[PDB]
Amino acid sequence: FRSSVLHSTQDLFLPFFSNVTWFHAIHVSGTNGTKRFDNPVLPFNDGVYF
């Protein structure tokens, strides 16, 4: 706990104003009819702001 102090830490945080991969996932009824969505495998380098 720290009350009104300034502390510097060296950990793994999400950098500000970067590029985040919005991935839209939901049932997608196709023109043919086959239902699909956005689905691959996302790597976990060392952290995820889900």
Partner: protein, 49 residues
């Protein structure tokens, strides 16, 4: 994803407005100057990079 039922006629093109969107960013070894409040909560941060 809910195969459940599709109700043809309203969702023929899949979706129009949008159901949900999940964001996946990547954490990076960064120096963060954290400002703690008198209650002990962080109000703002600063990344040197």
């Amino acid at each position: 994803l809910h195969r459940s039922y599709l109700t043809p006629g309203d969702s023929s093109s899949g979706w129009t407005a949008g159901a949900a969107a999940y964001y996946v960013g990547y954490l990076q070894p960064r120096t963060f100057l954290l400002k703690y409040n008198e209650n002990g909560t962080i109000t703002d941060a600063v990344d040197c990079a």
